[PDB]
Amino acid sequence: PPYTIVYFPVRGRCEAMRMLLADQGQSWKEEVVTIDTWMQGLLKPTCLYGQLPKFEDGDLTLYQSNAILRHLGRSLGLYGKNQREAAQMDMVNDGVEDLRGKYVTLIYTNYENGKNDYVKALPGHLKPFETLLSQNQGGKAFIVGDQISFADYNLLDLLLIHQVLAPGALDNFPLLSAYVARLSARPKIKAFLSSPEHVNRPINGNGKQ
């Protein structure tokens, strides 16, 4: 700490890290970058890869959302109890990222002509996570192990935005449905998902969801 999130005024690739920080009783500063400011092209060239979010943790400045998540997981003790779990958490998080990428592509470049197809192939992309849960404590714990990890927050966010994209998304996924509800009931999470900062923030930059 202190923690500072530099991002556009949307949930997008930052809602997961915010739930993590909130569920760990951490406070952070939000630096909102409007599209107008970004179009001026002043901040963009200063970003390592020309993109946001940008994260500041004390003297450390990071880019790449997944790198930020892993940093928080490693520093706040949300990365498993050993190398074996750490590897499994990375495997889970990479899967989460692959789906988010496709979700993003759908939202921003082909929403009206590709939603039906996307929702059609969605169960196939969610099944792996249902399987993962079934293999861990029968699915009554977390995605990996008995302790919540950064992967959980990223996966939770992914599942939540897909339930908005497709209402009955988890109908045929009992473990994932109970998983989402279980984590959403976590006091700090419930409070976060209920806060105005979160409610007032649109899921994506084009309003589509």
Ligand X SMILES: N[C@@H](CCC(=O)N[C@@H](CSCc1ccc([N+](=O)[O-])cc1)C(=O)NCC(=O)O)C(=O)O
Question: Which of 2, 29, 38, 84 is close enough to bind its own copies by CB under 8 A?
Answer: 84
Q: How far is the CB of 155 from its own copies (least distance, A)?
A: 13
Q: Which of residues 36-55 bind ligand X (CB under 6 A)?
A: 44, 50-53
**Which one of its own copies, ligand X, none is in contact with 10 (Cβ closer than 5 to 8 A by kind)?**
ligand X
Helix axis angle, 187-194 relative to 174-184, nearest 10°?
80
Q: Is 157 exposed, middle or buried (0-12, 13-18, 19+ CB in 10 A)?
A: buried
Q: Is 193 in the site for ligand X (CB under 6 A)?
A: no
Q: How far is the CB of 3 from ligand X (least distance, A)?
A: 16
| Helices assigned H by DSSP within 76-195 | 83-109, 111-135, 150-165, 174-184, 187-194
Q: Which of residues 12-41 bind ligand X (CB under 6 A)?
A: 12-13, 35
What is the spatial distance between Cα 74 and Cα 85, in angstroms, rounded to a whole number?
12
- Identify how many contiguous H helices and E strands the chain contains and give both numbers: 9, 4
**What phi-psi label fits residue 30: left (phi over 0), alpha (psi between -120 and 50 degrees) or beta?**
beta
Count of residues touching ligand X (by CB under 6 A)? 17
- The strands making up 54-57's β-sheet, listed across from edge to edge, are 28-32, 3-7, 54-57, 60-63
Q: Which of residues 59-118 bind ligand X (CB under 6 A)?
A: 64-66, 94, 98
What is the spatial distance between Cα 71 and Cα 201, in angstroms, rounded to a whole number?
24
Q: How far is the CB of 131 from its own copies (least distance, A)?
A: 7
For residue 209, how many other CB atoms are within 10 A of its CB?
A: 12
C-alpha closest to that of 32 among 20, 14, 48: 14
Q: Is 48 in the site for its own copies (CB under 8 A)?
A: yes
Cβ nearer to its own copies, comparing 14 with 189? 14
Question: Which of 12, 53, 95, 139 is close enough to bind its own copies by CB under 8 A?
Answer: 95
Q: Residues 195, 184, 30, 9: is their CA dihedral positive or negative?
A: negative
Check the annotation: does 126 bind a ligand. no
Check the annotation: does 64 bind a ligand. yes
Q: Is 6 in the site for ligand X (CB under 6 A)?
A: no
Question: Can you say which residues are annotated as belonging to the binding site for glutathione?
Answer: 7, 13, 38, 44, 51-52, 64-65
Q: Which residues of the chain form contacts with ligand X (CB under 6 A)?
A: 8-10, 12-13, 35, 44, 50-53, 64-66, 94, 98, 205
Question: Can you say which residues are annotated as belonging to the binding site?
Answer: 7, 13, 38, 44, 51-52, 64-65
